[PDB]
């Protein structure tokens, strides 16, 4: 059916994990400065993203199929999984915001 | 294992998106009346559903695999995605009810 | 990329349904005692799990792909589907805890 639709500048929406992960990635290496040698690396492979941060070791952060959707493996706080509530990425365990979690674990490695 | 189960009138539960989309579809063309020419068409293809409504143009509404589940493309309010909270379909962005959203956008096209 | 990761005792996280279903399963046959003949069987096939409980008949409990994730077929309360909120398995219909639901339906069959 309708031609009223496909004559528009259509596009494909984009995964919301994908999105977070960019404003993460760039928000991140763009702190790979204020890294006084101590956050050496951000790497965003292919919906897999790594922090070297020898202070605690290395974080991995994946996209993942549901039962629920972004996966956190923090070498300090350990493992967690996230889905959207009100447009925030939040913890399936107890509903903390992953932003916050990194935001801490990350500020602790400058601070220290 | 058990024969105590498959001797019952068994069935397969049905997608909850599927359900909404019917009591939507029929709730909808059944307003394709009170359409004073101005909501011309509802079309429910194959888990894809279209509103022609030339007042703003044409809405699409899909079933979608998670990262989250019913997709709204409103030619007026733009794009949104929905999952169940308390048995309501609600917005992943901010948790509004999609019922409400259509309910407005739709009443605006008679009103106008 | 990094070797700082795969030299750790890595593992694969485990489905959260899977988990519930074990501390369920064992929590369950381990009540297949206090079963005064009246909860005869728990069977955990392959992410499919059955209660014979002739008092109401037989419960099935599945893992299921999302639109949402653990499926309850109670021969008494009928059918329900569950996902995590704050690390609890909760009802998509109205957000009751499935623990509670079984916890009742199950205590009713001793009680009676």
- Determine, yes or no, domain membership for C38: yes
SS (H, E, C) chain C: CCCCCCCCCCCCCCCHHHHHHHHHHHHHHCCCCCCCCCCCEEEECCCEEEEEECCCEEEEEEECCCCCCEEEEECCCEEEEEEECCCCEEECCCCCEHHHHHHHHHHHHHHC
Q: Is residue A107 part of a domain?
A: yes
Closest partner residue to A93 among C5, C13, C87, by Cβ?
A: C87
For residue A2, give the nearest of B52, B79, B94 by CB distance.
Answer: B52
Query: Is position B24 within any domain?
Result: yes
Give the contacts of C20 (CB within 8 A, at least 6 positions apart): C70, C89
The CATH number for B47's domain is: 3.30.920.10
Residue C39 counted as domain residue: yes
Contact C52 B4 (CB under 8 A): yes
Q: Please report the sign of the dihedral spanned by the C-alpha atoms of residue A91, residue A96, residue A101, residue A102.
A: positive
> Where are the alpha helices (H) located in chain B, listed in sequence order?
16-29, 98-111
- Report the DSSP beta bridge partners of residue A58: A52
Residue C2 lies in a domain: no
User: Which among C65, C66, C86 is the nearest to A94, CB-wise?
Assistant: C86
Under 8 Å CB-to-CB from C68, ≥6 apart: which residues? B16, B83, B84, C81, C82, C83, C92
- B86 touches A: beta carbon within 8 Å: no
Q: How many domains does chain A have?
A: 1
With respect to residue A105, please indicate whether it lies within any of the assigned structural domains.
yes
Contacts of C99 (CB under 8 A, 6+ apart): C88, C89
The b-or-e profile of C4-37 (16+ CB within 10 A means b, else e) is ebeeeeeeeeeebbeebbeebeeebbeeeeebee
B86 neighbourhood in chain C, CB within 8 Å: 93-95
3-state secondary structure of B107: helix
Q: Answer for the pair A85, A97: CB distance below 8 angstroms, yes or no.
A: no
> C91: how many CB neighbours lie within 10 A of its CB?
21
Contact C10, A60 (CB under 8 A): no
Asked if residue A2 belongs to a domain, the reply is no
Domain assignment present for residue B79? The answer is: yes
Cβ atoms of A21 and A60 closer than 8 Å: no
Structure determined by: X-ray
Segments forming the whole domain that contains residue B41: 15-112
């Amino acid at each position: 059916v309708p031609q009223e639709v496909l004559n528009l500048p259509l596009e494909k929406a984009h995964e919301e994990a994908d999105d977070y992960l960019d404003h993460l990635l760039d928000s991140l290496e763009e702190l790979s400065e204020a890294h006084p040698d101590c956050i050496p690396d951000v790497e965003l492979s292919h919906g897999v993203m790594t922090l070297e941060i020898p202070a605690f070791g290395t974080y991995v952060i994946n996209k993942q199929p549901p039962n629920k959707q972004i996966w956190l493996a923090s070498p300090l706080s350990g493992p967690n999984r996230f889905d959207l509530l009100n447009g925030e990425w939040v913890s399936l365990r107890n509903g903390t915001k992953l932003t916050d979690i990194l935001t801490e674990e990350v500020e602790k490695a400058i601070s220290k």
